[PDB]
């Protein structure tokens, strides 16, 4: 008959075999991740090979249906996803070359190691020692030397392979109808076919730039305060008007500023909010923590976990011969099986991470009724924001008092709120310019406007411009600094960490508004409220069946991302930082260089 | 003396309930029917009687009894009802609008699931038209969907009509096997010859 009926017939088969193949592959992956053995690796290889092969013939067969004869707009999305995500266009030699290059990237990042100068006796790896050194050690020479040494021993090797990589990726883009790989990445947010909700790929760059324009004053005030405080630690090295040295940010790349909290406490005399000793006194185990997390979800109206989740999931490190990765993850094996994999200790951080991970499980259970190809979030940002909005409420003093970990005798005034807001700020606000810088530089390099011989040249020039950080040691084109990043080496889109953050504060401000809350925004709880729960669930159950602009409209009432809630969240800190910056110069100078 | 007891410990205890698209039908006649023994099983996920009262089963007595048994997924049991619609209702087992009887449905996960996967339970996913009430279909022919007749071979727009369930112990409720038994009664111009025990 018509094309529509044939396409529906084909989809009604595809779904049925897809489900089973996905289950097999995901179960093999879980079996390896909880039981590290060679035969588990072989099982993963076999299952993944079967799944990846099946996707290939399905992508080939889907070509016979032209997309201009579909007007339902729901079949079209499934057909587009199936056609795109499994199609290969490069020649066999180029394909295997690209695969080998990617495998080399991963292998060299994992196996990379640096160690002490002029001593080949003993050496260490990045995760065990380097992270601890840059997080805790205060030695200027040690930090600067390690920061230089890892880059020298990694980026120099990775540079020519990246030069070969970018080419192949660009021809991959060119063979398709995209302009370049950058636009291929930007196509995730593309929306077409709906009047009043269309979103163009090029609009994202302008939106990102406009959003970053408004948030500059808060970042520069925080930068001035950080510079003033850091003057106490390293007086000689730091200039009152220059950019901060790149090796004094508390981590390897300066992605997060959390490690500087102790060095930059606003009021150290006053006690800090800590409940670890309270949980120790009350003899809390992992099951109690997860039951409390589940009760928090029940209190808002969302259904709680099934029996299979309790029986199958593991929450403690097996130890002994049984070795497994303790990176917290939320597995959705499909066909009604949800699990959480994490090793739990009796700490506040694990208590909050439990809620953060459980949010993902609830979101996964929300859209279980949708077809297989539409079982995902509206874009790459919603999923992360959903799991983060709830850790904000979990950490508020009111929730802790209601649960009982915090004594009722606790009081709130200036310093408690200021310290909490500053601790949140050094984690949230600091990372935005870094992410925007990295993504913009990668967009430019993929655009091809920048020649290879200036790759480093521009890289640092814009570092002193936006981020306001100057490198401590000059580098030539031999080094490839961005290659030292985990995400860059492993071919992962990085813009999702900028859209996620600005999303979450839009959600919270909405829910707190629905919960009839009054007072400061940062002290908000939604435990008893149920209207916010149903309003959230209405968007959660949608999945990918609707454009993300409409989904955003159904919760807040706007068709675009906004910055006002984020600033409104940190406004009391903004006023106090304005007060503290009366005698301190605002703005960094790009002319200064630490190495004379 | 109550001697001829209707056999109910056979339809409820056969250990092999066959596939849905080929459902076994049993005719019960010429015996004393006791309905108190069905309750001696595990708690039943679905126990629904439409035209009769559960307490008034033993006194009223009818001509013959028809028993149907099969296995379906957990969340499809809601489709076994008069007036319902869906794949299983209109392609494998259709019930009349004025159906009179009872429907039994209970979970059997511990007996119809293996870690490797059970592929011995089938169902129909494509049919040219709908099914009349109380009908079965066993024919297996390639369901042509495209204009070109592909002469009954597998390929584009030519799919096998019989799909296959999968069953493993690690599934979640709603994808686990469920055993369903339907009882049907009727009357006509004939001696009853089938009644429950009298005290
Ligand atoms: C079309 O095909 C593409 C690729 O072929 C598929 O894309 C994949 O989609 C999944 C689903 O999001 C991606 O998985 C995500 O990867 C992120 C990257 O993390 C890496 O690094 C960490 C260590 O930091 C590793 O542990 C991890 O395994 C990755 O190697 C993760 O961060 C994501 O996890 C997030 O969500 C979980 C909850 O689900 C949280 O608990 C986490 O904290 C975190 O917030 C997530 O796992 C995957 O990366 C994509 N592939 C690529 C190459 O990008 C599409 O799925 C496919 N579309 C289909 C089939 O419809
Ligand atoms: C685009 O295609 C989809 C899928 O073919 C269409 O969804 C279908 O919508 C109809 C009604 O809108 C659904 O019918 C309903 O079926 C249930 C039983 O599942 C029944 O109880 C209801 O009374 C109703 O008859 C149908 O199920 C649904 N398809 C699927 C696979 O769920 C959609 O309507 C199409 N778009 C447009 C604009 O028509
Ligand atoms: C949501 O409702 C529950 C049920 O009352 C609240 O739990 C009580 O909290 C008070 C503190 O205000 C305690 O004194 C009670 O002992 C708690 N009762 C139970 C049964 O836990 C909970 O505090 C409410 N949530 C919020 C944020 O107020
Ligand atoms: C892990 O793998 C080994 C090797 O096959 C197996 O004997 C064991 O049962 C598996 N599971 C656990 C929990 O060790
Ligand atoms: C939450 O779990 C309990 C069992 O601990 C259960 O009794 C209750 O019904 C669940 N909540 C909902 C809304 O079903
Ligand atoms: C602390 O809060 C009180 C509110 O009564 C206010 O009067 C005072 O100025 C605040 N102090 C600072 C340093 O902001
Ligand atoms: C009937 O079911 C019971 C339940 O335990 C079982 O022991 C018995 O063997 C069954 N009879 C058969 C299968 O003939």
Residue numbers in the entry:
A (entry chain D): 19 to 614
B (entry chain A): 331 to 529
Pull text from the paper.
Local refinement was performed on the RBD–ACE2 complex to observe the interaction between RBD and ACE2 with better resolution, and the structure was reconstructed at a resolution of 3.38 Å. Although the S486P substitution occurs in the ACE2 binding motif of the XBB.1.5 S protein, the overall binding mode with ACE2 was not significantly changed compared with XBB. However, differences were observed in the RBD–ACE2 interface between XBB.1 and XBB.1.5: in XBB.1.5, RBD Q493 interacts with both K31 and H34 of ACE2, whereas in XBB.1, RBD Q493 interacts only with K31 or H34 of ACE2 through an alternative conformation. In XBB.1, RBD Y453 interacts with ACE2 H34, but in XBB.1.5, the distance between them is more than 4.0 Å. A common feature shared by ACE2 receptors bound to the XBB.1 or XBB.1.5 S protein is that the N103-linked glycan of ACE2 is positioned towards the active site inside the ACE2 structure. Finally, to understand the effects of the S486P substitution in the XBB.1.5 S protein, the RBD Y473–P491 loop regions in the closed-1, closed-2, and RBD–ACE2 structures were compared between XBB.1 and XBB.1.5. First, the Spike-hACE2 complex of XBB.1 and XBB.1.5 showed that binding affinity is enhanced by S486P mutation in XBB.1.5.
At the end of 2022, the XBB.1.5 variant emerged, a descendant of XBB that acquired two substitutions in the spike (S) protein, S:G252V and S:F486P (S:S486P compared to XBB.1), and a translational stop in ORF8 (ORF8:G8stop). To gain structural insights into the recognition of the ACE2 receptor and evasion from neutralizing antibodies by the XBB.1.5 S protein, we performed cryo-electron microscopy (cryo-EM) analysis of both the XBB.1.5 S ectodomain alone and the XBB.1.5 S–ACE2 complex. We determine the structural basis for the interaction between human ACE2 and the S protein of XBB.1.5, showing similar overall structures between the S proteins of XBB.1 and XBB.1.5. Our recent report showed that the S486P mutation in S is a determinant of enhanced affinity to human ACE26.
